[PDB]
Amino acid sequence: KLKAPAVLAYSRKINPTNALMFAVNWSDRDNTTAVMVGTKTVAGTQSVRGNPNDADKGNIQTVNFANLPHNKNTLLVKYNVKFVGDVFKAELGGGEYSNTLQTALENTDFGTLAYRYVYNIAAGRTLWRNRVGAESIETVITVNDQTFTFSDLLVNEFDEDVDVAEIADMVAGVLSGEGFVTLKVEHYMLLGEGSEVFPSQEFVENSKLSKQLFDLNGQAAMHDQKIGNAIRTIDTWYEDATTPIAVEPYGSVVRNGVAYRAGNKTDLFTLMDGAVNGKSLTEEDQMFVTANLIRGGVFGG
Amino acid sequence: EVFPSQEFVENSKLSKQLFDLNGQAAMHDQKIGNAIRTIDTWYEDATTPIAVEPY
Amino acid sequence: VFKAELGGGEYSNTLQTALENTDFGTLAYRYVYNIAAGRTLWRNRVGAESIETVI
Amino acid sequence: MRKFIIVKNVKVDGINAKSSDITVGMPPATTFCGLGETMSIKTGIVVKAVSYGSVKFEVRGSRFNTSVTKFAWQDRGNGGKANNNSPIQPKPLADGVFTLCFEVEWEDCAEVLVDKVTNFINTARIAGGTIASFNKPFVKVAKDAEELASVKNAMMPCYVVVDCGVEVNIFEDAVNRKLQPMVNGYKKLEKIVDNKHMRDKFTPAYLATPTYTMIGYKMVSNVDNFDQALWQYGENTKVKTIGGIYND
RNA sequence: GAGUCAACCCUUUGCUUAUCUUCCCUAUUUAAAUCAGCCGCAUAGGCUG
């Protein structure tokens, strides 16, 4: 009775595009140029722990690089993102079980989710290592033929902002059952003159190179998956460990190999079954269980 | 004459290639890095020091 | 300085707490001297009459 | 034939190139058939002829072992091991720019159809892809067969896909003639008895395997007669060409 | 549905000896390139800082 379904699916509500990278001047923003990739060679020793003997051998390697031209000082990262509604409508599996979760939900505040998503977009968390060493970071966003210029900073010390509230409310209304909205992100940055640039890598079986860079017809670009992971890092719903992480069931990032949200009564599937059998829970956890539901995917097993 | 950096490519026509950005002699941005951080004057002997690296 | 890019919550923090008791002035001085002395300019300097650095 | 709608320079991102366990690259025409019937059921118009073209197509990676995507833990069987090196599940992706040209018959208006088709396209998927940017679709008019060449003078340039036929079986013929395979349809083998985990409880459940046909990518001007590029549903869940066997 | 951090590729070098490219040729015909300016939805004298 009320057996947990082993097959359930939901659509990708947030669709990011392929981020594209350009070099443009600070004061000559009319004329821009693409950034190539090229290939170069390196020759470094071996720095391997616990191997004193192999310190006297060389090593020749070949890698791809990317950086601003000899005379440019502005990096331009531009892409498009799409928010769609149709939430709580299963696309593969479930016709009489999603509604049983619906009658428990709709008590959550989508405005907070929209505020956090737009704040993540505006602050610049979509750029991982490009922000190290830049004094000025600004963006311009054009949605529904109206434009907004943001110079937001200070990803830390979260504070209420009323200048970004209107777009957050718009998209929050969009999520609770509407069509689609498209946002153009046009991040401008002034990292420096000739400094290195960091586009997304991809790994291949051992080949002639050892560090390949993502290329779109002779131009560096960023993967969609990384941007999507940037969009969905809002999880501030546990008592410690500030600088929140991305949202997913059994939420734990392998990059640094941390194990958060383990089998210590804070998971995804552990919640609704105890909610329907017993009393409800705090407003904090409905937030989380709808956050990871908005991201599309297949759940079950 | 000058001396820019050199490449080690597979068996091609050339025998001693040179680094260039759009056809312009240049040096890699790690030879300069190796030149900046050669301050390791902190072992038992051998003045005219070496760079800083484990082992 | 003193924060690892990947991993490290207790080892790196303890290592930091042990550190920042030394002098950064010596390291900065040696780095800037290596920049100014022209040692960053590799063996083009052989057979040089007179050189200058503008920083 | 009366009305044709054309959309060009459609940028699609993150296409799932693993069409089958052996075919990687251009998506099969069966997805085009599925999208066409979905458009037919949604908008309410019967569509007979389907046409498409290729402009740009780049596969993420190199000559071999193109691209691998890191999959994380998304199953309720974790908690202890879910802290390092989630399973890999290799699945390459790609990127592309395509174009479409469809036939539609409707006499109530002329622009409402454009509105609804644009609205549907704005919220669609292309073999796991995502529409990035597309041009404004435009309308063309045709009457009968002799003036049909006009349309080939209306939407250049692109490539065309034409049937050439197979002799006995393709296992060696594909290598010998150095053309490319493509899945023209599916052949049913047995019936799936179980009806538990299906998305519906009334649709019959059958098991099928792909069938391979020969197509070729050529220039439009090198095509003598256009009817070789039309696709019509055939007997036994097959798709055929109007003109039949290619001849000079 | 996150491939993520780090790096000195260096030294030396004789390319050189000779060479006939050559005969023939009808580019034909037609052509049009035309001082925003006050009250006036007007190609009838113009009193305008």
Topology:
The structure is cut from a larger assembly and holds 3 copies of chain A and 1 copy of chain D (about 250 residues).
Chain A: E1 8-10, E2 14-16, E3 19-24, E4 32-34, E5 40-43, E6 60-63, E7 74-84, H1 98-102, H2 110-123, E8 137-143, E9 146-150, H3 165-175, E10 180-189, E11 221-222, H4 224-231, H5 269-276, H6 283-294, E12 297-299
Antiparallel strand pairs in A: 1-12, 2-7, 3-4, 3-7, 3-11, 5-6, 7-10, 8-9, 8-10
Chain D: E1 3-13, H1 29-43, E2 50-59, E3 94-104, H2 112-121, E4 130-131, E5 138-141, H3 149-152, E6 159-163, H4 170-177, E7 180-191, E8 206-219, E9 231-234, E10 238-241
Antiparallel strand pairs in D: 1-3, 1-4, 1-5, 2-3, 6-8, 7-8, 9-10
The structure holds one RNA strand of 49 nucleotides.
> Helical proportion of chain D?
10-25%
| Multimerization state | part of a larger assembly
Query: What is the beta-strand fraction of chain A?
Result: 15-25%
Q: Name the structural class of chain D.
A: alpha+beta
Q: Into which percent range does the helicity of residues of chain A fall?
A: 10-25%
Order of helices and strands of chain A: EEEEEEEHHEEHEEHHHE
Query: Largest sheet of chain D, described in full?
Result: 5 strands, antiparallel
PDB class: rna binding protein/rna
Keywords: CRISPR-Cas system, RNA
Entry title: ICP1 Csy complex
Chains A, B, C: Csy3
